[PDB]
Tab-separated table of C-alpha atoms and ligand atoms in Angstrom:
chain	number	residue	atom	x	y	z
A	1	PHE	CA	-3.972	-13.025	-15.138
A	2	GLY	CA	-6.914	-11.637	-13.118
A	3	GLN	CA	-8.689	-8.316	-13.648
A	4	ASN	CA	-12.052	-6.989	-12.491
A	5	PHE	CA	-13.325	-3.619	-13.699
A	6	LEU	CA	-15.377	-1.099	-11.724
A	7	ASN	CA	-18.820	-0.676	-13.306
A	8	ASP	CA	-20.751	1.283	-10.688
A	9	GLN	CA	-21.157	4.983	-11.482
A	10	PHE	CA	-22.186	5.908	-7.919
A	11	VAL	CA	-19.289	3.946	-6.375
A	12	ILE	CA	-16.883	5.493	-8.896
A	13	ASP	CA	-18.102	9.042	-8.086
A	14	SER	CA	-17.642	8.184	-4.411
A	15	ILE	CA	-14.061	6.938	-4.863
A	16	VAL	CA	-13.284	9.984	-7.043
A	17	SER	CA	-14.626	12.502	-4.495
A	18	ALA	CA	-12.699	10.541	-1.844
A	19	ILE	CA	-9.463	10.875	-3.858
A	20	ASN	CA	-10.354	14.510	-4.560
A	21	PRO	CA	-8.029	15.025	-7.543
A	22	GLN	CA	-7.050	18.622	-8.144
A	23	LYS	CA	-5.229	20.397	-10.964
A	24	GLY	CA	-1.514	20.838	-10.304
A	25	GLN	CA	-1.107	17.524	-8.489
A	26	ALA	CA	0.954	14.643	-9.862
A	27	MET	CA	-1.582	11.763	-9.973
A	28	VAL	CA	-0.389	8.289	-10.963
A	29	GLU	CA	-2.908	5.516	-11.664
A	30	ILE	CA	-1.939	1.865	-11.336
A	31	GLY	CA	-4.019	-0.526	-13.430
A	32	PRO	CA	-6.302	2.047	-15.113
A	33	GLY	CA	-7.979	-0.908	-16.829
A	34	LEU	CA	-11.001	0.226	-18.830
A	35	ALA	CA	-10.651	3.838	-17.588
A	36	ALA	CA	-13.423	3.556	-14.974
A	37	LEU	CA	-11.546	5.841	-12.605
A	38	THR	CA	-9.220	7.264	-15.272
A	39	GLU	CA	-11.998	9.079	-17.143
A	40	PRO	CA	-13.584	11.035	-14.247
A	41	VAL	CA	-10.158	11.681	-12.677
A	42	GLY	CA	-8.731	12.788	-16.061
A	43	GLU	CA	-11.622	15.232	-16.647
A	44	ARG	CA	-10.533	17.172	-13.542
A	45	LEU	CA	-6.897	17.415	-14.687
A	46	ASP	CA	-4.690	18.687	-17.493
A	47	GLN	CA	-2.096	15.889	-17.052
A	48	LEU	CA	-2.190	12.284	-15.831
A	49	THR	CA	0.267	9.404	-15.540
A	50	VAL	CA	-0.786	5.761	-15.696
A	51	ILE	CA	1.050	2.462	-15.478
A	52	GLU	CA	-0.819	-0.341	-17.182
A	53	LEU	CA	0.641	-3.832	-17.574
A	54	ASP	CA	-1.751	-5.093	-20.277
A	55	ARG	CA	-0.559	-4.166	-23.774
A	56	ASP	CA	-4.073	-3.841	-25.255
A	57	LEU	CA	-5.457	-1.816	-22.338
A	58	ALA	CA	-2.511	0.590	-22.483
A	59	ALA	CA	-2.916	0.945	-26.273
A	60	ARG	CA	-6.637	1.740	-25.887
A	61	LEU	CA	-6.073	4.585	-23.398
A	62	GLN	CA	-3.528	6.024	-25.847
A	63	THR	CA	-6.287	6.566	-28.435
A	64	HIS	CA	-9.002	7.542	-25.908
A	65	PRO	CA	-10.677	10.706	-27.334
A	66	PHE	CA	-10.422	12.830	-24.166
A	67	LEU	CA	-7.752	11.178	-22.030
A	68	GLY	CA	-5.275	10.594	-24.896
A	69	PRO	CA	-3.734	14.105	-24.923
A	70	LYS	CA	-3.528	14.277	-21.095
A	71	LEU	CA	-1.821	10.886	-20.544
A	72	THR	CA	1.688	9.589	-20.070
A	73	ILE	CA	1.358	5.782	-20.186
A	74	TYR	CA	3.894	3.251	-18.876
A	75	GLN	CA	3.287	-0.212	-20.269
A	76	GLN	CA	4.815	-2.371	-17.516
A	77	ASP	CA	4.751	-3.951	-14.077
A	78	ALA	CA	4.373	-1.260	-11.395
A	79	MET	CA	6.892	-3.315	-9.372
A	80	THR	CA	9.686	-2.447	-11.808
A	81	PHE	CA	8.690	1.248	-11.753
A	82	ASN	CA	10.868	3.797	-9.982
A	83	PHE	CA	8.344	6.112	-8.334
A	84	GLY	CA	11.098	8.137	-6.671
A	85	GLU	CA	12.512	8.964	-10.097
A	86	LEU	CA	9.017	10.042	-11.237
A	87	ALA	CA	8.560	12.312	-8.220
A	88	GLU	CA	11.947	13.774	-9.088
A	89	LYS	CA	10.865	14.306	-12.688
A	90	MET	CA	7.467	15.665	-11.575
A	91	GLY	CA	9.085	17.965	-9.001
A	92	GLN	CA	6.590	16.952	-6.297
A	93	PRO	CA	5.420	13.813	-4.446
A	94	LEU	CA	2.952	11.576	-6.261
A	95	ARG	CA	-0.682	10.776	-5.469
A	96	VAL	CA	-0.858	7.147	-6.383
A	97	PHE	CA	-4.229	5.479	-6.781
A	98	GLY	CA	-5.986	2.667	-8.535
A	99	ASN	CA	-6.622	-1.033	-8.639
A	100	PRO	CA	-3.379	-3.055	-8.593
A	101	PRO	CA	-3.512	-6.646	-9.866
A	102	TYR	CA	-4.008	-8.921	-6.837
A	103	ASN	CA	-0.756	-10.863	-7.476
A	104	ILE	CA	1.329	-7.738	-6.721
A	105	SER	CA	-0.944	-5.808	-4.337
A	106	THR	CA	1.160	-6.710	-1.252
A	107	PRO	CA	4.661	-6.304	-2.768
A	108	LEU	CA	3.641	-2.972	-4.378
A	109	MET	CA	2.870	-1.396	-0.985
A	110	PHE	CA	6.326	-2.390	0.242
A	111	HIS	CA	7.820	-1.060	-3.001
A	112	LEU	CA	5.887	2.200	-2.603
A	113	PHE	CA	6.692	2.554	1.117
A	114	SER	CA	10.434	2.618	0.387
A	115	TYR	CA	10.089	5.787	-1.723
A	116	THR	CA	8.878	7.562	1.442
A	117	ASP	CA	8.885	11.298	0.591
A	118	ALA	CA	8.193	10.615	-3.094
A	119	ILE	CA	4.618	9.551	-2.312
A	120	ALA	CA	2.088	12.122	-1.035
A	121	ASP	CA	-0.644	9.520	-0.551
A	122	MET	CA	-2.186	6.339	-1.934
A	123	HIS	CA	-5.779	5.293	-2.639
A	124	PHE	CA	-5.939	1.611	-3.499
A	125	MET	CA	-8.693	-0.835	-4.226
A	126	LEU	CA	-7.658	-4.078	-2.558
A	127	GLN	CA	-9.009	-7.360	-1.303
A	128	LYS	CA	-10.910	-6.918	1.973
A	129	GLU	CA	-8.686	-9.332	3.916
A	130	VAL	CA	-5.638	-7.256	2.888
A	131	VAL	CA	-7.308	-4.038	4.111
A	132	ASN	CA	-8.000	-5.852	7.385
A	133	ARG	CA	-4.317	-6.785	7.634
A	134	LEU	CA	-3.112	-3.224	6.861
A	135	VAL	CA	-5.128	-1.607	9.674
A	136	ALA	CA	-5.087	-4.502	12.206
A	137	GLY	CA	-4.189	-3.887	15.839
A	138	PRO	CA	-2.455	-6.501	18.032
A	139	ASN	CA	-4.319	-9.614	19.320
A	140	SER	CA	-6.017	-10.317	15.998
A	141	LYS	CA	-5.702	-13.008	13.310
A	142	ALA	CA	-5.368	-10.163	10.771
A	143	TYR	CA	-2.430	-8.589	12.676
A	144	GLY	CA	0.813	-9.641	11.002
A	145	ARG	CA	4.059	-8.410	9.451
A	146	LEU	CA	2.193	-6.205	6.943
A	147	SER	CA	0.252	-4.461	9.743
A	148	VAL	CA	3.490	-3.448	11.471
A	149	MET	CA	5.402	-2.369	8.356
A	150	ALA	CA	2.523	-0.393	6.857
A	151	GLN	CA	1.707	1.303	10.164
A	152	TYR	CA	5.390	2.042	10.675
A	153	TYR	CA	5.418	3.952	7.359
A	154	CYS	CA	1.867	5.154	6.939
A	155	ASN	CA	-1.340	6.345	8.490
A	156	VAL	CA	-3.726	3.680	7.178
A	157	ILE	CA	-7.374	4.682	6.632
A	158	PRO	CA	-10.037	2.305	5.240
A	159	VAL	CA	-12.139	4.553	2.996
A	160	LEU	CA	-14.953	2.638	1.284
A	161	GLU	CA	-16.384	-0.913	1.273
A	162	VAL	CA	-16.983	-2.237	-2.232
A	163	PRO	CA	-19.223	-5.300	-2.795
A	164	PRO	CA	-18.414	-7.663	-5.697
A	165	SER	CA	-21.451	-6.542	-7.768
A	166	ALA	CA	-19.749	-3.167	-8.520
A	167	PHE	CA	-17.243	-5.056	-10.697
A	168	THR	CA	-17.500	-6.764	-14.078
A	169	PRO	CA	-16.823	-9.560	-13.593
A	170	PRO	CA	-17.420	-9.904	-9.829
A	171	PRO	CA	-14.517	-11.160	-7.652
A	172	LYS	CA	-14.599	-14.069	-5.175
A	173	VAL	CA	-14.167	-11.703	-2.187
A	174	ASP	CA	-15.154	-8.307	-0.798
A	175	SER	CA	-12.992	-5.279	-1.598
A	176	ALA	CA	-12.240	-1.958	0.052
A	177	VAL	CA	-10.621	1.303	-0.921
A	178	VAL	CA	-7.862	2.254	1.491
A	179	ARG	CA	-6.035	5.545	1.949
A	180	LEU	CA	-2.359	5.340	2.938
A	181	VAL	CA	-0.581	8.544	3.974
A	182	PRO	CA	3.169	8.339	4.690
A	183	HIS	CA	3.769	9.891	8.138
A	184	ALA	CA	4.839	13.551	8.085
A	185	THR	CA	6.417	12.690	11.453
A	186	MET	CA	7.318	9.064	12.243
A	187	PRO	CA	5.437	8.050	15.412
A	188	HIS	CA	8.043	5.355	16.070
A	189	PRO	CA	11.243	6.391	14.238
A	190	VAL	CA	13.606	3.491	13.566
A	191	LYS	CA	17.359	3.849	12.906
A	192	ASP	CA	17.399	0.937	10.438
A	193	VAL	CA	14.098	-0.170	8.816
A	194	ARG	CA	15.841	-3.274	7.475
A	195	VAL	CA	16.105	-4.574	11.060
A	196	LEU	CA	12.396	-4.003	11.751
A	197	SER	CA	11.604	-5.803	8.502
A	198	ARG	CA	13.754	-8.755	9.611
A	199	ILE	CA	12.406	-8.974	13.171
A	200	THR	CA	8.812	-8.970	11.882
A	201	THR	CA	9.689	-11.511	9.181
A	202	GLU	CA	11.245	-14.024	11.604
A	203	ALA	CA	8.618	-13.274	14.277
A	204	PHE	CA	5.600	-13.932	12.041
A	205	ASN	CA	6.977	-17.065	10.362
A	206	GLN	CA	6.362	-18.705	13.749
A	207	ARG	CA	3.079	-17.094	14.838
A	208	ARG	CA	2.151	-19.814	17.339
A	209	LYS	CA	5.615	-20.040	18.952
A	210	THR	CA	6.484	-17.574	21.731
A	211	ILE	CA	8.754	-14.562	21.060
A	212	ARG	CA	11.333	-16.305	23.306
A	213	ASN	CA	11.250	-19.298	20.909
A	214	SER	CA	10.542	-17.411	17.650
A	215	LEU	CA	13.462	-14.983	18.043
A	216	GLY	CA	15.758	-16.340	20.754
A	217	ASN	CA	18.172	-16.006	17.825
A	218	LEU	CA	18.216	-12.209	18.122
A	219	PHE	CA	17.344	-11.332	21.718
A	220	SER	CA	18.268	-12.935	25.026
A	221	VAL	CA	15.531	-13.361	27.646
A	222	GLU	CA	17.084	-10.503	29.671
A	223	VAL	CA	17.065	-8.075	26.725
A	224	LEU	CA	13.341	-8.647	26.114
A	225	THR	CA	12.333	-8.381	29.764
A	226	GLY	CA	14.640	-5.360	30.083
A	227	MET	CA	12.460	-3.825	27.366
A	228	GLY	CA	9.228	-4.611	29.254
A	229	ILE	CA	8.380	-7.540	26.946
A	230	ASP	CA	6.848	-10.761	28.291
A	231	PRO	CA	8.870	-13.599	26.647
A	232	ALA	CA	5.717	-15.782	26.734
A	233	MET	CA	4.011	-13.479	24.183
A	234	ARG	CA	3.388	-14.604	20.620
A	235	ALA	CA	3.936	-12.313	17.590
A	236	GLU	CA	0.298	-11.091	17.582
A	237	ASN	CA	0.689	-9.823	21.168
A	238	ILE	CA	3.538	-7.405	20.442
A	239	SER	CA	2.497	-3.840	19.673
A	240	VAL	CA	3.800	-1.847	16.693
A	241	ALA	CA	5.762	0.425	19.079
A	242	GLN	CA	7.290	-2.638	20.770
A	243	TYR	CA	8.533	-3.999	17.390
A	244	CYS	CA	10.068	-0.588	16.663
A	245	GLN	CA	11.679	-0.618	20.120
A	246	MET	CA	13.220	-4.045	19.433
A	247	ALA	CA	14.517	-2.825	16.056
A	248	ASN	CA	16.041	0.225	17.699
A	249	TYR	CA	17.618	-2.072	20.303
A	250	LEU	CA	19.411	-4.333	17.767
A	251	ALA	CA	20.644	-1.387	15.671
A	252	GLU	CA	22.092	0.354	18.751
A	253	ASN	CA	23.672	-2.755	20.337
B	301	LIG	CL1	-13.543	2.571	-23.248
B	302	LIG	CL1	1.464	-11.136	7.772
């Protein structure tokens, strides 16, 4: 449980103009809620898809006077949803947007990243501290596994800052809308993304320990220094490119 609904008309119109929905596109809203974004987005379209977990909230959109005829509604967890299959059915990549429940906001990005070409872009309302993590550069408390994985997959652009008073009820923290665009060309292509995922996982479990300590399991001291990496570095010190280099190393050797 845990839902906060956008109430601010001027913020909503900002988010909507930021998303810039256009007829012909395959928009998919996650957590439409009380139709705060769904209404104004819907008005611009002839067809819309929404995934809403709450049984009552999904039922209400079904009988909405204007949205009703335009909507395909999936009453379920967005985590269990095959977006690739939808993009296949739609015949084009999806523009996913909305306000995912906090409890799945991190896993859903990962889920969505794996469909790669099936997603045109994403506009999400998320906790501020998560937006900080997504866009974080090295040498920061916010820089972590998520930073590296998201930046591997996507251009990450913070779009709008949203204070709690634009929600009923207000949340305990600040929020931000973030745009994520899967890379047309991978800046740091990686032969096996599973390896990058693993390196980052094991690296960031031991943030304080040095890369030499934290992943002496996977790389010898010579391998790291042969890559230009200082073994005395902690996980926060290693650039996104460097992580991708290490992943490419293990896959090729
Ligand atoms: Cl309503
Ligand atoms: Cl992290």
